[PDB]
Every structure is written in C-alpha cells, then in structure tokens.
C-alpha cells in the first residue's frame, strides 16, 4: 500500500522497499502491486521533503537499474497519473499504462448481471432497460 512504507527514521522507508522487493524476488516469479502509487511519487521536483525524494529515487533504482529485476512483474494503481514522476512512466519501469475507465451500456449490463447473480430477483425484472437508462454510473 502507498503510505504504509513511510517510516519515522531516516533511511527506513527505502529499507522497507528493499525488503519488499527482495522478498518478492527471493523465491519465485512474483507479482507486486503498489496501490495508490501517487502517494509515494510526488514527482521529485515539486516536492520539498527529502524523504520523499529519497524514496522516489529508491523506487526508480529498484524498478530499473543495474541488475534490475529477474522475472518479476509490477502493477500500480492511481487516480492522478499526471502527478507521477516522469522517470517512472518510462519503458522498463511502467511501459503499458492501461486505462480502466467508464464502461458503456454493454459494460453496465455486464456489471448488473454480475452483481445480481447471487441475490434472488422477481419474475417481472429486466436488466436491459435498467442498464440502458443508467448513463454515468461507473462500476
């Protein structure tokens, strides 16, 4: 998680990231997931906290440096992509930025059918009209 790596002492957040990546690469092909990565990537230029800069640099070095990674995959999730260090949005660190945006009518129908699969409905219920009437509802 994003803010949970931050620590009190000087030189411990980076130690936390080192331990996390070492554990991920220690044993098997692994997937890492950094939820809300924008909370620990303040762009390193608009921020004055030196701990923030150091943790950003450590993340850059862990993602892509000499002896970068050995069969490990990293995934991130954010709401504000533009508020990320441009050095992190490069091939070799975050190469494919997938856009999980608002669904269309068909997607909303799929979501309705998924969520109403375990609850018991009435005979006189339809989801096509209900899906079509809904316009802006996302997920």
């Amino acid at each position: 998680n994003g803010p949970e790596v931050m620590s009190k002492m000087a030189g411990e957040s980076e130690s936390n990231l080192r331990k996390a990546f070492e554990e991920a690469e220690k044993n098997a092909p692994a997937i890492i997931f950094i939820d809300e990565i924008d909370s620990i990537a303040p762009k390193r230029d608009k921020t004055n906290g030196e701990v923030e800069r150091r943790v950003v640099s450590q993340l850059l070095t862990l993602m892509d440096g000499m002896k970068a990674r050995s069969n490990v995959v990293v995934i991130a999730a954010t709401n504000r992509p533009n508020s990320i260090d441009p050095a992190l949005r490069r091939f070799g660190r975050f190469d494919r930025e997938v856009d999980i945006g608002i669904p269309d009518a068909t997607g909303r129908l799929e979501v309705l059918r998924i969520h109403t699969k375990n609850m018991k409905l009435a005979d006189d219920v339809d989801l096509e009209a209900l899906a079509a009437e809904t316009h802006g509802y996302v997920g």
């Binding site: 998680n1 949970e4 790596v5 936390n16 331990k19 996390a20 554990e23 098997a28």
Partner: peptide
C-alpha cells in the same frame, strides 16, 4: 503464496 507488507513487518 501470498504476502502483504505489514505481515512481513510484523513477522520480522
């Protein structure tokens, strides 16, 4: 085959 950051921090 699953771990979380706080789990490892608690373990050590």
């Amino acid at each position: 085959r699953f771990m979380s950051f706080s789990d490892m921090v608690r373990g050590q």
